[PDB]
Design a protein around this ligand. Structure first.
Ligand SMILES: [Mg+2]
Ligand SMILES: [Zn+2]
Ligand SMILES: [Zn+2]
Ligand SMILES: [Zn+2]
Lengths: 171, 57, 607, 100, 192, 115, 46, 54, 105
DNA sequence: CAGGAGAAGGAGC
DNA sequence: GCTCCTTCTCCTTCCTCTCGA
RNA sequence: UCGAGAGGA
């Protein structure tokens, strides 16, 4: 249960090439390049956007007065408007047991792909005493093969690199 | 030291030589034409301190 | 300046806070205690002034941020002072609060009721309430009724300010204008004038001695009167350091949030920070980064010479007052104190005075008169050779041509005559869009020297591809892809900026120095006159500029954006400057030959 | 999210208390020279950056002349926000003004 | 930063108010050249008519509101004139002081209105028998001429007021035609 | 107009320091175009049209295998008037170290000349 | 004189709201008189 | 580094986030693929393996 | 276009949280990462962050010489003359902290 | 070589 | 408690070139 | 980088 919705108040710049369709202008200019990315102010991965309700700099205007006044910079021709929008954020915090995908079981690592989104790489010492690799598949403490899916915990969220690195131990 | 005095003009004294100014004694004899060069040998004036004073008598 | 990248944020207001050493030690990156700036090899020696953690260098890198010198803004260091030193800006205020303090009760010499009413008045002078700042003198009725007086004054001020904030008299963050500031400066001047007179204490009746300074740093403590020492023992000349003064004024300020939250803050103080004596005293000299102290390229920076003198005194005291304390307090007894502690009354002069010369270089120590004494940080700000009147107000700019001026009555009064020197050299950044593709394809094909042409092309990524070394077919190939944009996500909303030449469409500014009035600077449409070097005009302009033609020079400024060329053609063009606002009179008409032409032509004997 | 939404409503209330409706505006409907210059400049920058041109220009490369031609039928979608000294701002569209 | 605001008041940068109207009339010194040249503007009448275009200035301009007030101010003015200014108490406001001169056609300064009415007094023969030019049409033209020639909200008149005093001081030749006592003259006086 | 440029290579030596940089060329490869304005003893020939940046004197360094070259200073295309070669007032323990080139610049009457 | 007025400006903790032209040139935003006495905004369709 | 026209300048939060149910996922996040027929295409190409398993 | 946009137009960056132009350096990432801008006064030590509920690895960043820091994220780009930055570094030697209040908050 | 101006403290009032 | 006769303690057009440290 | 001198307006 990590498909959450959050309302945010961002502040976009609007291009003069879209002073006639600002809805699709901001949907192509700022919202589409935030799909499937970490963000430092929500801490999650965005999956869908809905509810682009651009505010107006006219305080006496309404929802049907669509003369949406957008403020012009003193030098550049770009606009800078406030917007409220709902996002479908996917984020774990500490240890969320969710199913997974595995392409190839390997020897010294395992290499889980988290529902074709990111990686769940497991280090050397995180491999327990009972689990040893055989020459690729695993024979664990059961001794019988399992389904291709796999549930796993969450250790820590590492966002320095190109993608988010999420670790998980299995005890 | 005398070549330094003629090369810069900054008078280095132990008694001031009973003058007022310190710098500006030697001017480069330019030769752009004969008039400018013959001018520098008859160019006398009061001083370089009076050029900053604003009372003009 | 750029147009493809808009400035996102916006600076609104500027506040004047104080760094203290608690902020600076968390702030800075490297302590600087070594005079070994460069070794005999010439390399930067760490711990010294040209350290590699204070920014990059020429062949080096930065140890703090790790980037090249093109991209390294530099980082600032901190010299840990041995002694809390006087900030030489704040000195007379410290002298006032020290000379008007009581050493015993650790409040002021003046009575507490007057201090409380000046606190209430200067609190009323933060919301602008001058309507109530003189009603407070009309509140006057021992030991305990004065407490009721102060409580009633306090709740009176409370109800007045709460009433003014209830309606729309004053907003949340006060109001501060010239009337408010005049009243406040007058009251604070009268307050600090009254504090310098009441020598006898109004809280205990004891006596604190008079101080008198010699120059800047020495504070002779004047000996007391006979009757004052007598009155001291009934109720029951000397140099003085800065740590004693720090302790005295800190003990004063810790008991005195009341009046000094109001003298030192002319606004409603939101965060309610405290008033320490650490604002007056210095503990770390913040050394500037590398790229603001580089040598001339060779003479090194004269700021480093004074920092090396400060660190020479700092290592002398790190020698002495660390290596004397490890010695015994019994063997260092009698004849080891008339010489060694005759040196700490001479090595504190040279840690204070060198920081003074580092900042306030007027207060210094004499010498046999030499060439030039070294300027400080105050000396690099104050005058026409300073910083405000030399690098913020009066700047040297790009895109500004200059030559001699010439007569030309075959071009109109709003027209400028441009020689092809400047028609080749100066450029203008037009974007590329299909209404302007023909002239820009022809301008890139013509190249850097066939006017109309173009010298540079700025990509959507911001790269300045120059056309100088490129051949004929290495310019004719570029105009076949200016039209097609890229598939880039970030720059599908931009276009390449062709830097074309100045041509007959543009408009320049013109400017003859000195400008005594505002008609000495106008805007002129462009004509390129072939095979010349001088700029040249009509004669209508040459009465406004006070321009004869015995060799005058003018600064053609060529503005680079569409905003200024849309303002140079309407608000400051020559056609809107006919009447000067001195008297509403014309200054622009024809001159010498045209007047005697018009006398002969309009005469009756011209058939 | 409580404090930011609170300060958001604070700032929008302090801005709406300054906003003056179209029943009250005590400013003249003459464009000054300054408003004409800035409207021509800003429309020049907008047309220079791929705006839909509302005129059918006949051989023009100067974008400032394109802006001066679009003003002839007042086809300039901009609005001047005139600032009284206390930030109490009025909105005048370009197509509600005496273009002088 | 001392400039002209939208309430037509000479107000500084933050809001400190220096004057209420620019000079007394909120006029521009450049564009006030031929306004008191009434004998000129009687002529070239159709030229100024096609210049000013009053018929496009009908709907966005409340006309007769200041016009009813101004005649009452002028009749109360001529009603009490011989008394000095301390005897001359104030009953109600002048014409510009109540009504906005750039929105109400007819909100006109007092001395210009007095010179207009005195010119239309002493030269009725030129109005009657030269081109049949009506006096009411000429007055309703000059009421528009006073309003088109008004100072703009936004003009830095502080810079201009500085430069129009600093620059003519450069024309002051330092010798002094003084003797006939004496008095300090020129830049030694203007700096003092 | 007659300019003069006194090029010397005695700016990096003191107290009998050996001659680091010699006038002339060396036995490496070098772009071969420099001969059009330079003699093969480093110095330029008399009377040569030199625009901006074209060479005025060439020296072979002994250290870095470099024939580092002197480029023309200003932008007025001048003509080489003289190449004077000054000896040393010591006992000529050093080689040639001082070359005082002159330059000639034409001044036609042009638009702006104050007669 | 700078450091006298700077001494006074620190000892008030003086907020400055960027009102005069000189402070708006030092900081470099826009100047208040003339063109910068107002703003421009853009009507859009929907 | 990125400029002021790719990712927005200032992002804050207005309200604390609230979960959605399983059947309320595909109220728009199914028609988002039914209406849009790497930053947009591989987005839904990886959303085919994320939101389907709920 | 004659005193800012020609001479020393410097599109600098200010910490929104403390308001100072001089401090906010570049971060030093690992290989296969990105280098953002992080503050210095508001960012605090990694050795002092474990004072206390568990801390996510978001505010953690690294400098050049390896001292890992925590925090100081809120920075944004303004456009100033470069002589403003020279003025701030000339005033910091006198002991003055200019604060630049910047909206959008 | 100016050119007076503002602020301050003790010697008389 | 109040005042005057000295101090401190202050501050100010654009451009080009060369010479020398 | 600072002082001295020359010169134009
Ligand atoms: Mg002249
Ligand atoms: Zn660095
Ligand atoms: Zn006491
Ligand atoms: Zn910070």
């Amino acid at each position: 249960n990590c498909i959450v919705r959050v309302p945010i108040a961002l502040y976009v710049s609007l291009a003069p090439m879209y002073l006639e369709n600002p809805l699709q202008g901001v949907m192509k200019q700022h919202l589409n390049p935030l799909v499937m990315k970490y963000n430092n102010k929500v801490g999650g991965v965005v999956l869908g956007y809905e509810g682009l309700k651009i505010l107006d700099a006219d305080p006496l205007s309404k929802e049907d007065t669509s003369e949406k006044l957008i403020k012009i910079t003193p030098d550049t021709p770009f606009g800078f408007t406030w917007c409220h929008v709902n996002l479908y954020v996917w984020q774990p915090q500490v240890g969320d047991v969710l199913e997974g995908y595995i392409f190839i079981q390997s020897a010294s690592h395992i290499g889980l792909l988290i529902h074709d989104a990111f990686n769940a790489s497991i280090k050397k010492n995180n491999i327990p005493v009972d689990w040893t690799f055989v020459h690729g598949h695993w024979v664990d403490s059961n001794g019988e093969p399992i389904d291709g899916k796999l549930r796993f915990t969450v250790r820590n969220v590492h966002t320095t690199g190109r993608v988010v690195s999420v670790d998980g131990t299995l005890i | 030291k005398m070549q330094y005095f003629l090369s810069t003009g900054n008078l280095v004294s132990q008694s001031g030589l009973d003058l007022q100014q310190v710098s500006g004694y030697t001017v480069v004899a330019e030769k752009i034409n004969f008039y400018r060069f013959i001018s520098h040998f008859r160019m006398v004036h009061r001083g370089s301190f009076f050029a900053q004073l604003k009372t003009t008598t | 300046m750029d147009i493809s990248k808009p400035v996102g944020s916006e600076i609104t207001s500027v506040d004047f806070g104080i760094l203290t050493a608690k902020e600076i030690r968390n702030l800075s990156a490297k302590q600087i205690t070594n005079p070994t700036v460069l070794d005999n090899l010439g390399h930067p020696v760490s711990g010294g002034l040209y350290d590699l953690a204070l920014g990059a260098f020429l062949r080096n890198l930065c140890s703090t941020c790790g980037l090249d010198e093109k991209f390294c803004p530099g980082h600032q260091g901190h010299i840990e002072l041995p002694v809390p030193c006087y900030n030489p800006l704040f000195f007379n205020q410290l002298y006032i609060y020290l000379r008007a303090s009581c050493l015993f009760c650790h409040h002021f010499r003046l009575k507490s009721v007057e201090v409380h009413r000046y606190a209430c008045k200067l609190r009323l002078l933060q919301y602008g309430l001058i309507d109530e700042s003189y009603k407070l003198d009309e509140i006057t009725l021992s030991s305990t009724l004065l407490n009721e007086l102060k409580s009633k004054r306090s709740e009176y001020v409370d109800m007045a300010i709460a009433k003014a904030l209830s309606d729309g008299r004053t907003t949340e963050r006060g109001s501060f204008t010239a009337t408010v500031n005049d009243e406040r400066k007058k009251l604070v001047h009268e307050f600090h004038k009254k504090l310098l007179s009441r020598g006898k204490c109004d809280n205990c009746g004891m006596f604190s001695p008079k101080f008198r300074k010699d120059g800047f740093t020495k504070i002779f403590e004047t000996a007391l009167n006979e009757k004052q020492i007598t009155n001291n023992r009934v109720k029951g000349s000397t140099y003085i350091l800065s740590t004693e003064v720090k302790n005295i004024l800190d003990t004063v300020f810790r008991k005195e949030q009341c009046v000094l939250q109001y003298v030192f803050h002319s606004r409603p103080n939101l965060s309610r920070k405290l008033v320490k004596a650490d604002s007056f005293f210095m503990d770390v000299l913040v050394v500037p980064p590398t790229r603001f102290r580089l040598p001339s390229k060779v003479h090194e920076n004269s700021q480093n010479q004074l920092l090396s003198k400060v660190l020479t005194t700092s290592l002398l005291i790190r020698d002495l007052n660390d290596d004397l304390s490890k010695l015994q307090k019994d063997k260092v007894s009698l004849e080891d104190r008339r010489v060694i502690f005759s040196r700490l009354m001479n090595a504190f002069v040279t840690i204070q005075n060198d920081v003074n010369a580092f900042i306030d270089s007027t207060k210094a120590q004499g010498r046999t008169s030499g060439k030039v004494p070294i300027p400080g940080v105050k000396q690099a700000l104050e005058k026409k050779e300073g910083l405000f009147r030399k690098h913020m107000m009066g700047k040297r700019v790009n895109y500004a041509a200059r030559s001699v001026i010439s007569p030309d009555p075959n071009i109109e009064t709003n027209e400028i005559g441009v020689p092809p020197v400047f028609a080749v050299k100066l450029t203008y950044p037009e974007p590329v869009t299909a209404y302007n593709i023909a002239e820009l394809r022809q301008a890139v094909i013509n190249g850097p020297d066939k006017w109309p042409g173009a010298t540079q092309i700025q990509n959507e990524d911001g790269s300045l591809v120059s056309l100088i070394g490129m051949s004929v077919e290495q310019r004719k190939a570029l105009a076949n892809q200016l039209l097609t944009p890229s598939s880039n996500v970030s720059t599908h909303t931009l276009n390449k900026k062709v830097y074309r030449h100045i041509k007959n469409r543009d408009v320049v500014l013109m400017n003859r120095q000195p400008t005594l009035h505002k008609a000495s600077m106008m805007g002129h449409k462009v004509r390129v006159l072939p095979n010349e070097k001088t700029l040249r005009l009509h004669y209508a302009n040459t009465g406004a500029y006070n321009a004869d033609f015995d060799g005058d020079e003018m600064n053609m400024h060529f503005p680079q954006n569409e905003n200024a060329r849309a303002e140079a053609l309407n608000l400051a063009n020559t056609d809107s400057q006919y009447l000067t606002p001195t008297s509403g009179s014309p200054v622009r008409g024809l001159i010498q030959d045209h007047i005697s032409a018009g006398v002969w032509l309009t005469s009756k004997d011209s058939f | 999210p409580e404090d930011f939404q609170q300060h958001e409503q604070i700032r929008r209330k302090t801005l709406k208390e300054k906003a003056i409706p179209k029943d009250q505006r005590a400013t003249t409907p003459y464009m000054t020279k300054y408003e004409r210059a800035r409207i021509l400049g800003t429309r020049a920058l907008q047309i220079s950056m791929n705006a839909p041109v509302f005129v059918d220009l006949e051989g023009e490369t100067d974008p400032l002349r394109i802006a001066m031609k679009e003003l002839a039928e007042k086809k300039i979608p901009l609005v001047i926000r005139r600032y009284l000294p206390d930030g109490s701002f009025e909105d005048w569209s370009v197509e509600e003004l005496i273009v002088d | 930063g001392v400039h002209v605001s939208y309430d037509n008041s000479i107000r500084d940068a933050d809001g400190t108010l220096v004057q209420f109207m620019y000079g007394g009339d909120a006029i521009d010194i450049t564009k006030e050249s031929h306004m008191t040249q009434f004998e000129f503007c009687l002529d070239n009448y159709y030229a100024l008519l096609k210049k000013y275009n009053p018929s496009a200035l009908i709907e966005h301009l409340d006309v007769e509101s200041a016009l009813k007030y101004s005649k009452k101010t002028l009749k109360y003015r001529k009603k009490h004139s011989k008394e000095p200014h301390y005897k001359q108490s104030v009953k109600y406001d002048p014409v510009l002081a109540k009504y906005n001169p750039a929105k109400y056609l007819g909100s006109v300064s007092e001395n210009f209105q007095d010179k207009l009415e005195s010119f239309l007094d002493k030269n009725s023969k030129l109005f009657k028998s030269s081109d049949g030019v009506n006096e009411k049409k000429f007055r309703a033209l000059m009421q528009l001429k006073y309003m088109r020639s008004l100072i703009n909200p936004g003009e830095a008149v502080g810079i201009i007021a500085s430069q129009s005093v600093g620059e003519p001081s450069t024309q002051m030749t330092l010798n002094t035609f003084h003797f006939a006592a004496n008095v300090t003259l020129g830049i030694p006086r203007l700096r003092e | 107009m007659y300019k003069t440029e006194k090029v010397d290579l005695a700016l990096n030596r003191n107290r009998g320091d050996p001659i680091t940089q010699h006038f002339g060329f060396g036995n490496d490869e070098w772009p071969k175009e420099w001969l059009e304005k330079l003699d093969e003893d480093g110095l330029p020939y008399i009377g040569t049209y030199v625009e901006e940046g074209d060479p005025i004197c060439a020296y072979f360094d002994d250290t870095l295998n470099k024939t580092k070259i002197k480029t023309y200073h200003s932008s007025e295309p001048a003509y080489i008037e003289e190449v004077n070669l000054i000896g040393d007032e010591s006992n000529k323990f050093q080689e040639l170290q001082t070359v005082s080139i002159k330059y000639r610049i034409r001044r036609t009457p042009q638009i702006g000349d104050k007669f | 004189t700078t450091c006298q007025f700077l001494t006074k400006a620190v000892l008030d903790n003086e907020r400055e709201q960027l009102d005069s032209p000189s402070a708006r040139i030092v900081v470099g935003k826009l100047n208040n008189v003339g063109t910068g006495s107002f703003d421009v905004l853009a009507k859009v369709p929907n | 580094t990125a400029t002021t026209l790719n990712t927005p300048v200032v992002i804050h939060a207005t309200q604390l986030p609230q979960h959605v149910s399983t059947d309320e996922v595909l109220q728009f996040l199914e028609s988002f693929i039914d209406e849009k027929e790497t930053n947009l295409s591989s987005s839904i190409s990886q959303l085919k393996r994320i939101q389907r398993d709920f | 276009d004659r005193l800012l946009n020609s001479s020393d137009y410097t599109q600098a960056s200010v910490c929104r949280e403390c308001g100072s132009i001089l401090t906010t350096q570049q971060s030093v990432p690992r290989i296969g990462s990105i280098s953002t801008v992080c503050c210095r006064r508001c960012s605090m030590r990694f050795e002092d962050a474990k004072k206390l509920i568990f801390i996510d690895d978001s505010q953690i960043w690294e400098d050049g010489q390896g001292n890992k820091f925590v925090g100081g994220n809120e920075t944004t780009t303004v456009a100033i003359p470069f002589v403003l930055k020279y003025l701030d570094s000339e005033l910091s030697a006198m002991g003055i902290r200019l604060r630049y209040n910047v909206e959008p908050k």
